[PDB]
Write a protein that binds this ligand. Sequence first.
Ligand SMILES: CC(=O)[C@@H](O)[C@H](O)COP(=O)(O)O
Ligand SMILES: CC(=O)[C@@H](O)[C@H](O)COP(=O)(O)O
Ligand SMILES: CC(=O)[C@@H](O)[C@H](O)COP(=O)(O)O
Ligand SMILES: CC(=O)[C@@H](O)[C@H](O)COP(=O)(O)O
Ligand SMILES: CC(=O)[C@@H](O)[C@H](O)COP(=O)(O)O
Ligand SMILES: CC(=O)[C@@H](O)[C@H](O)COP(=O)(O)O
Lengths: 242, 242, 242, 242, 242, 242, 242, 242
Amino acid sequence: AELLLGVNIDHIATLRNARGTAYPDPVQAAFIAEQAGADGITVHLREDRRHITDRDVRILRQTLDTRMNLEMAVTEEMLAIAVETKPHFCCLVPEKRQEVTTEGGLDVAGQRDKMRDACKRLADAGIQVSLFIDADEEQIKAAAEVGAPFIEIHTGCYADAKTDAEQAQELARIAKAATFAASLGLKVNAGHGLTYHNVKAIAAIPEMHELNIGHAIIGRAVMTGLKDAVAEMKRLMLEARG
Amino acid sequence: AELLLGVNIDHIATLRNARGTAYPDPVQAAFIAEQAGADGITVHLREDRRHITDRDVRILRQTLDTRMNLEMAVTEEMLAIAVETKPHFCCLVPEKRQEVTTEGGLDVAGQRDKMRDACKRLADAGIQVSLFIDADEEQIKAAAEVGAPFIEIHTGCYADAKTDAEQAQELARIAKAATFAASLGLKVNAGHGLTYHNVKAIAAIPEMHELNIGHAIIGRAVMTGLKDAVAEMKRLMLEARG
Amino acid sequence: AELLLGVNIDHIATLRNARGTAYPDPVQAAFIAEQAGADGITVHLREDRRHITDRDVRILRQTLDTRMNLEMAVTEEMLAIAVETKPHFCCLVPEKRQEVTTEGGLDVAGQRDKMRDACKRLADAGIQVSLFIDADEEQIKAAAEVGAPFIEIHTGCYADAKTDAEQAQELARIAKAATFAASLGLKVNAGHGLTYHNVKAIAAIPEMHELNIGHAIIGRAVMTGLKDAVAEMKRLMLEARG
Amino acid sequence: AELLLGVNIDHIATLRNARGTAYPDPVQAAFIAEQAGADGITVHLREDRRHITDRDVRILRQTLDTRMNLEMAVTEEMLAIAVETKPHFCCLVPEKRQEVTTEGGLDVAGQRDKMRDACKRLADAGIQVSLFIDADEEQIKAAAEVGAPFIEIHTGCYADAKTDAEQAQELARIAKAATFAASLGLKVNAGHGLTYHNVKAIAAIPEMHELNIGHAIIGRAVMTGLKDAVAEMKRLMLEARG
Amino acid sequence: AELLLGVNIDHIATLRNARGTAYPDPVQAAFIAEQAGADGITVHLREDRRHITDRDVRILRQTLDTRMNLEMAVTEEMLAIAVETKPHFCCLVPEKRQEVTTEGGLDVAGQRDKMRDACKRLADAGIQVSLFIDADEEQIKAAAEVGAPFIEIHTGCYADAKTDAEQAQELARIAKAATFAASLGLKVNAGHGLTYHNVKAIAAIPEMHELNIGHAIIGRAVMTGLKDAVAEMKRLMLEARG
Amino acid sequence: AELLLGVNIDHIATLRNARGTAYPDPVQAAFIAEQAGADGITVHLREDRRHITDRDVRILRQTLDTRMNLEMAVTEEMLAIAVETKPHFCCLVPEKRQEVTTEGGLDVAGQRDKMRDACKRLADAGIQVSLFIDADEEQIKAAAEVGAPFIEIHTGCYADAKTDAEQAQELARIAKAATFAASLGLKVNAGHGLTYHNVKAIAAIPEMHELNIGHAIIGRAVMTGLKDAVAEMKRLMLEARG
Amino acid sequence: AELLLGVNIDHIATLRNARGTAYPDPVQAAFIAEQAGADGITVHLREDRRHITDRDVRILRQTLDTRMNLEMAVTEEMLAIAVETKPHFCCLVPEKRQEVTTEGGLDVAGQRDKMRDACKRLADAGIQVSLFIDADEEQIKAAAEVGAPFIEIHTGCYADAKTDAEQAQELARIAKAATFAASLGLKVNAGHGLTYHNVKAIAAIPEMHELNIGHAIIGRAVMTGLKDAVAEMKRLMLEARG
Amino acid sequence: AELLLGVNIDHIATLRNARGTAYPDPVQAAFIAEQAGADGITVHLREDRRHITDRDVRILRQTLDTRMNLEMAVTEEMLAIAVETKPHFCCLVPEKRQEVTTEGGLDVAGQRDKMRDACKRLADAGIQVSLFIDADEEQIKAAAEVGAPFIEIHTGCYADAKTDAEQAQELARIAKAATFAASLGLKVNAGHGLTYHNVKAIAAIPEMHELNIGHAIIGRAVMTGLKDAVAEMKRLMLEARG
Ligand SMILES: CC(=O)[C@@H](O)[C@H](O)COP(=O)(O)O
Ligand SMILES: CC(=O)[C@@H](O)[C@H](O)COP(=O)(O)O
Ligand SMILES: CC(=O)[C@@H](O)[C@H](O)COP(=O)(O)O
Ligand SMILES: CC(=O)[C@@H](O)[C@H](O)COP(=O)(O)O
Ligand SMILES: CC(=O)[C@@H](O)[C@H](O)COP(=O)(O)O
Ligand SMILES: CC(=O)[C@@H](O)[C@H](O)COP(=O)(O)O
């Protein structure tokens, strides 16, 4: 199957927000990424508007040349913005104000009715919803039951592995989890913590549809520039698939 | 005695600390900068270690090919770190309403004793001290008395000007402060808020010795790569001087 | 004695509008140009919206990192648009709604009343007005007489000169006129028809403040890319001022 | 099974024709494209000469290093010019602006006689003919009847698809049509609204011989330069093929 | 005064004529050069057409964006062609026993009547005529006598000098010759043999108006490409004149 | 198995010899080529020393990092030079094309005695011999009979094919000759007239071991530079084969 | 199976140590290489510290983004350093006569007890050990029984093979060895002497896990820059595995 | 006022000799440097042939496009080599303990007889000799009397300066020594230990004719490639001078 790359540009905004300036502008990064290998642009509108802001999402929706993937918390505030913005994709993730980044996966089991109503509301607006969960068989079953067509498997543990043996374990865990998801008719994506040195093993998973990568790309971009950083990532991914 | 460029790489660490990673590494950025037009490297070690860390300071002191400029608040902890680190340059600045003036500069005038002790503490360790203050006569005089060899004029107001008239007014303030400081035997630097579109007017000021710019350069770097970002700024500065 | 470059991106929209597509997007070009030597971005909102659209002006006002220069004809429609848009600059030009390009030369002396009202309404919105006129003393006096702080001398005749004698005469005319406008306290810009082979002669004119160039740059850009096209133009202008 | 790229440079003339200038010159673009991945150069000489002119065709025939594909309307004037110019390939299409012949594609089945005589007059001049038509069973059978060896499927509907579902439906219609066309002994091409984001699915169609793409490449070119724009499209195409 | 660069593309043709193929095409070389520092293109149409052919001149006259400098022998055939092609510049060169031993500049003094008619016939066509002659008193005096507006000093002996003393002596000659020609109301050009390592001394000569360099540029181009080759030469020239 | 690229740098010398200078130096071109895709370097030392000279062969044998392929005519002088030079390969070719040694490729069948001695003489010196011949049954068998290790099929007729039908025939005639030569235990190479647009069909023939290309690459280089030219050609070859 | 590239930066230090300078700094080379294709960085800390020094190791352990591979002799000093440094990998090499075989690999079979102790000590510290040995069916057995999970085949003889016959003979030797090593459960690496012209045949060996290359890459870097040098080598390797 | 750059490529050989390979080849480096800003190439033939070898000098004398500057000690072996090689320039340097001074320069004053001879012998061979001495008045006087036309001041001390005051002091010495040398009729050069960060102060010295730099450039080259390394240094030099 084909492998797509979704560039998350949140960290361009984390750099802008460090100061009250307008640069660097996520709108510019979007254009560069979309013309360098990005098949879609992902932004996570946090309730504390830590990096990406409402302004960014509003403009991006009008300038993006590819489909927008809006990552957000499952709250009334975000559900409302999502419906009005009508992005092509919507990835629901867990969120906390004092968190460094998206922690574990989203709890779909012990929160079924909440996720059921969310998927339906977004679906009515014409948005394809993806659920960001761990490589957990129980979480996978829920996602498929709440009505979500997509699920994004958290790869943070995989990328955080200390030893080669622990990494192999997380990798096998993800792969299996991805295989089962597919049997349930779920389309599977992955993301979080993927770098230039560990993306290939993940891109190798046949079931994987799109990888959403942000931090590693932006981290690389400050050195070589966004174009080469994105092109580099896409190439590695295609080499792993083919 | 032309115009030098000091590149502040704090925002490299800003991007890194955003996540729990080691990249991008300020150590790599320094090499790039030093070979693209930087005549020195600036790093601000904050009390909260927001971006630059002790590790960063410790390693950079061993890898820098050019002179190091340590930006820090006037505290015993920091003075101690500076004496141990022995950076070529040290710039004293206020940290979170710790001893700051309305405009944002260090209050040297109302803290002569504390500054006298710090400048001597650092001068005796072979460090050349600069005081970050507003383009103010009173502050300039106090910097001269305290013993500081350098002063770095706060150009944030000029950089934040909302109209051409306000910008022109701030420019004139700086130009006058630069000349007054020089008549007092001080060498004058500037920076903070400088961008690719307002840097020339400051670089044209005859008294300016070195400009320490960070945010705008890192801002451009995420798009164009650090090498072109640094080379660009340096060319603008030399065009304005020559 | 600094010489600025205003980049007119109208022809980016020309290529876009040739189809119902959204690419190439002027928003992208603006970032590229602004970081490659553009000191400002110019867009001409034609009544027929042949290239630049209302959407363009609206998004650009929000994404430009440099000042916006809004070129438009003198009509209630455009005056209202400019007032709510609050661009930094506004250049008033003659428009036929069917012309190939600005026929060059706004009749200010022949429309005193209308122009006087236009200049005041725009200035009341904090917009610095520039009148696009011919290198004619009467039209220029009329420009400063109606309030306009800026003027942009039409360089099309100079660019279209068919013989050396005709070209040198038109160059002398523009220069003579520039000096004249300056003695009136006016700020003088120039544009239309400037290319990589005739710009130097205009850049050399001491009184010139900003040159607005569009077509020649975009024409170069399709071959070499917008960044090098803009950088090339800016370098030639500065060399001429040297 | 080889997949070829035909670069249509009409829009280069579009940018030129915005003024009475000679630049940008289609002649230059041709060389750049042929050396960056173009296997042929395509030009559409419109009755109104909207972009490509008689001068362009005449000079290109003498400067092209590859093969020229002359896209034209089935008129006496064009057929005459085609025989005069003697391009390697000829692609017959409905009028421009907003067409004359029902739909986006050419009505071969409806003007069986006109085309039949057009294909023979051209084939006798040593020119290989292609008929631009919609993905339609009847239209194809008609193309085989009139004797045209080539056909080019209108990918416009596929490119304009507003939803994924709609796009996949159009893609399947194209694939089925292409397979059916080859069964009639016809060689099949395509490419009308093809872009960097939708080209792969088309290039992946086994029967496709050459994709003729113009607008997207030119729109990308104004940003990155023609060379990279053409090389980028060619790379994506071969990736989808092999 | 400013210094102009005239790029001779003859050796592009020599490369092509070696295989009698179509590439490399001088027409392509012209675009690249004109967009990288060339203020004009020079082509020598030999009667035997060793390199540049009739076809070359014919197309070039239609594609050049700058100005053509037709170098040719003083023959009725050549005169009739220059009058028809109507190049902006024309440089008369020797092809038979019209030379002056080594450092074979055109023999004007010995062919006063022939040159006189040539200059008058071409001038009536509005073609600026230049006489390629060696740095000789009498040859320079005859040039102004026959009415030639321009003269081009043969710097071949200077370029081939083996020792510093030899080169210095030749450089002095040229300098005296240029100054002497300027007094006679003559405009002076140079070229032939100039390289990246000896052009500055020539460009530093105040009287020099345009340098027409060819072979060194193309020889450089084969390694680094035309664009850079032309830009490098142009930069060296402007640095010298500075 | 794999396909190799041999770059003939003869035309670098053509451009140099055009004048009496030492640039462009084939020695430089060789390094560039060997580092951009060339797996060997080829030079044809003509008896008339038209381009490549004795100096060139002498220094190249000392500077080449890859195997040297010496193309020469069958004569005592050349045989003596080859034996002394000890290139890794030696390609025998007809010279002057107006003798009883040429008919297209080398006439081995008609000079069986001369070739037998040549192959033995060169093989004894540890040189791998290649006979440049047409895709002719008689010549191919004769090459193997004479003991030559390699043969190089003359791809000229294929490169000169006027029509698509003609080129198809020639391609088939080559493909057939290749398989036939491989069955006789001979290694088959090819070259001459191959360009960036017709090289793939040849590189696709499984039997081909190494393609030796000269003119096309140098013709591209004058525009794009040698590195690019060679890398481009190698990538195309590997795409067609691997 | 995946093929990894280990870049040995020792010769960067070779250049530095040639002078008492601090540049070129291995630390900078490591960042470059890790982002241009390196899956790991290799440094040989010699007892004499001829190039890489103790500080290089200490700093690199803290700046490397990938995995460190520490080449060292089997001594108490180095074992203590390795344990303290905790590199991901450790490759044992001969540095004295008594430790080397005639071919150049480490004499493992001759020092069973010593290597057994070494491997256990490093293994307990969490370090994966590799033994640099000859393609010998005795040293290989010794490597297994000693506990080393990895071995690195000395490809020095293969790198020196000049004739096709010698290359084939040495290659076959490495291949059989690799296959034998694998049958014993050993992981097999290679390198040493490998170049841009001989790396493919080795990379094509199925069992090869990682190639550690150094001098050839650095030698290319001085010409092209490290980034391109590393990328080129990585691309050639991956191509061999396709 | 003209400032030249002599690139010393010894360290290219240093890297090569470390493995005994043929690469990187000094001959290639020379072409790169001469085309990137080098006005000459310097090679130090060490008696022990530590880096540059006899073959290097032999080939270089034949491939250099510019002028050779052979650095060597004063010995019958080297004198003979110099006269046989015919380098444009010869720089006499110390290599034995009894030849070096306290600072590191050549002891001309102490060996006036040995130098007087060496200078005449070389001068008769047509070689311009330079004496590498410290910034010492006594050593300078001996240089003029001995007959040497050039002298190269040892900038080593200036480069190894430990403090700002210490460095400014060394700079004054050299600047005073350069002026003094000039009053004696001695042409003056310098270069040793010069880097991208300390060359300007030296280049600014009016008397300087040519700077011979090596290690700093090759150390930069390994990171960025020789072309940019040479180009960068040349630009910095011209910037300091004009
Ligand atoms: C891809 C995703 O859903 C996230 O896990 C990721 O960590 C986002 O991080 P930021 O919120 O810092 O962009
Ligand atoms: C302008 C810039 O980048 C800095 O110079 C400035 O001092 C930043 O300080 P912080 O890194 O504490 O925001
Ligand atoms: C510079 C200016 O104001 C214009 O005159 C120019 O001709 C604009 O042309 P477009 O309206 O085609 O951009
Ligand atoms: C997609 C493209 O660029 C063209 O192929 C298309 O035929 C354009 O036609 P016009 O140039 O008539 O718009
Ligand atoms: C130096 C150069 O390239 C030429 O200017 C010169 O006139 C060449 O003449 P030919 O092309 O007749 O050798
Ligand atoms: C195609 C090419 O460049 C050559 O291979 C060919 O052998 C050239 O021969 P000459 O250099 O004798 O024309």
